[PDB]
From Swiss-Prot, chains A, B, C, D, E, F:
<feature type="binding site">
    <location>
        <position position="57"/>
    </location>
    <ligand>
        <name>ATP</name>
    </ligand>
</feature>
<keyword id="KW-0547">Nucleotide-binding</keyword>
<feature type="binding site">
    <location>
        <position position="85"/>
    </location>
    <ligand>
        <name>ATP</name>
    </ligand>
</feature>
<dbReference type="GO" id="GO:0004550">
    <property type="term" value="F:nucleoside diphosphate kinase activity"/>
</dbReference>
<comment type="subunit">
    <text>Homotetramer.</text>
</comment>
<keyword id="KW-0546">Nucleotide metabolism</keyword>
<dbReference type="InterPro" id="IPR036850">
    <property type="entry name" value="NDK-like_dom_sf"/>
</dbReference>
<keyword id="KW-0067">ATP-binding</keyword>
<dbReference type="InterPro" id="IPR001564">
    <property type="entry name" value="Nucleoside_diP_kinase"/>
</dbReference>
<keyword id="KW-0808">Transferase</keyword>
<dbReference type="Pfam" id="PF00334">
    <property type="entry name" value="NDK"/>
</dbReference>
<keyword id="KW-0597">Phosphoprotein</keyword>
<feature type="binding site">
    <location>
        <position position="9"/>
    </location>
    <ligand>
        <name>ATP</name>
    </ligand>
</feature>
<dbReference type="GO" id="GO:0005524">
    <property type="term" value="F:ATP binding"/>
</dbReference>
<keyword id="KW-0418">Kinase</keyword>
<comment type="function">
    <text>Major role in the synthesis of nucleoside triphosphates other than ATP. The ATP gamma phosphate is transferred to the NDP beta phosphate via a ping-pong mechanism, using a phosphorylated active-site intermediate.</text>
</comment>
<comment type="similarity">
    <text>Belongs to the NDK family.</text>
</comment>
């Protein structure tokens, strides 16, 4: 019953990549346990990147993630956390391999189209933060 | 401006067709104004199909539409109501032409993969019934 | 229950369209009851086109249908005979509409990529002619 | 033998639809006789839409067709003029059926993604206007 | 004239992945020399996994491979044995890279969608076992 | 404003892979700055492979590259030279990974479907050689 949190960033949404990305997870065999289009508020974003509150790029992260609506989701499946990280590819598109989501759709680190939980613990945190309990099915 | 309500039925979600269908709307150029995976409550299903509460097939429509989660959404764009209707194809898959969502993905009337508002008026009503006002972006 | 016979002609196989076409039937929801790559014998071709053995274009139909291997198959599902007919599109690619197999892949009548049983009766006959009974699953 | 002129308009190029559209023609079996990314000059646009130089919407057609680069091409094959017309679908996306290029990618008449010669005669004229003779292969 | 044996397992067939998989081999440029839908008998399966007759997972392999119809095929092309192993990806999906068949469609080792000969010798053995000579074209 | 030169070789063109390949670059987010179908002359080809004028495979390179029309293009984007080399995959298809262009579409080194500049310097040279200045947009 392992699960992970995935967010299609503002750039992924405006470029119309939502369906293509979801399709990759569905053909893989993962179950969509939650899904919604939402607008991340300034405060919510800052809480998410709370650990980087002192970083110099913190303001940048917050700005981009709130620049427009995002699509949040929870995926379930065998070792889905690590499998999704593998599917997304390296955080910086230049190092992401062809076949991965960022390797196929992204060109810059600032607009790298998608985010996926790094660990099961981050997943639980992110799910509790972006989704209400009743939104999980 | 104009908006329409679309729902990928339980069979469409079960068969992993969410991304593929969503991708068709994004390729078309429509904007996703709202989106969420949800379980239709008995009340919502009855409210939705109230028109047939007398019909003998009513209990059937309700059981099916609540048989599993669906993906509800609101699409926005020029004449989106009539366009989506055309994109989905005939209600009965037997009459739905290839190239159409039902024409390419459905085989029976009971499990016809998707629903789309019939008119502008139906759209306003359905959107208000399936989504909380704050969920429209 | 209902079954229909489908054959991807020598041109369709030669052009590497087998998977793409098969995928359309699988996406539609039909079940593959039988499948095999085969070389149509002179006898089988004549038996199949017996109706035109008198016509002047007969020798042509036979030479083409035996010009290379074909992929024969039996598709199963609700009203599969009429549905497949619709999915293939008009026999003459000039009349075949986009979204259709012939509409998307064929350009001439002689090389129209695929064949599908015209009626339930034709289906029984074709299936018995192209497949050994034990090959139907 | 027969040839037709096709142009992916500025909106189609801007939205990254060049490969997808080109792929449909290649899958169909037509041959690419000519191809080039180009910026339509004011003279070329006026020459092309000369028929409407009197109309009030003329200045509009010109500004749009020259708003950005287009991908011009010449397709060759059996009855390619009428076939491409069918593949593109109705000029007004509202009338264009799913499965069609405009039916799948366009939403408004002003930005209808593509143009294709209406007749054999129009094809000869357009090809001579958009391409240098040595560019036809 | 190198060739290899590939089998789309019962899970790959029931999930409707036959066409998509074949399409990958066709676009790659490999030739389909044989193809058929078949039901592996208990005895046949045991002979195939004869080398593992003493293994503890032998009963499991036999059970799954006979749980439903499979699609067997022979592919021909330059170094096709090693190339197909590369295309399928690691035997355990968790270690299979995005872009490969198992990396894109599978989540568990038990249901890893496909099988491909490990060596030319295994290929000859598997072809002689699953196909009759006359079925090779 | 980095840019690179890409050529879809004669084999890629005759196999109808132009659109599919362009689509990969467009979905990635690269900008098409130039594009054209052309026939490489004997002299032009020899100049291109001038550095290999003394190699034993020089005659072979020249022959294949001139065996039919090719599609030349210039792509722009962040680190596009290295990114495109990554997308194309290893020069020899056998070593190209699934997900890359050669890994997915090619089987032999002689007909490896595509070429991309090795360095920014090679790119400038190739662009100056295959394109006229006015063809860059």
């Amino acid at each position: 019953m392992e699960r992970t949190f995935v967010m299609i960033k503002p750039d992924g949404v405006r470029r119309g990549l939502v369906g293509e990305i979801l399709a990759r997870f569905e053909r893989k065999g993962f179950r969509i346990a939650a899904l919604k289009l939402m607008q991340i508020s300034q405060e919510l974003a800052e809480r998410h990147y709370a650990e980087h509150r002192e970083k110099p790029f913190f303001p940048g992260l917050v700005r981009f993630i709130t620049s427009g609506p995002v699509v949040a989701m929870v995926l379930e499946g065998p070792g889905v956390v690590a499998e999704v990280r593998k599917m997304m590819g390296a955080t910086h598109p230049k190092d992401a391999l062809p076949g991965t989501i960022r390797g196929d759709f992204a060109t810059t680190i600032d607009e790298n189209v998608i985010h996926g939980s790094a660990t099961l613990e981050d997943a639980q945190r992110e799910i509790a933060l972006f989704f209400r309990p009743e939104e999980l099915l």
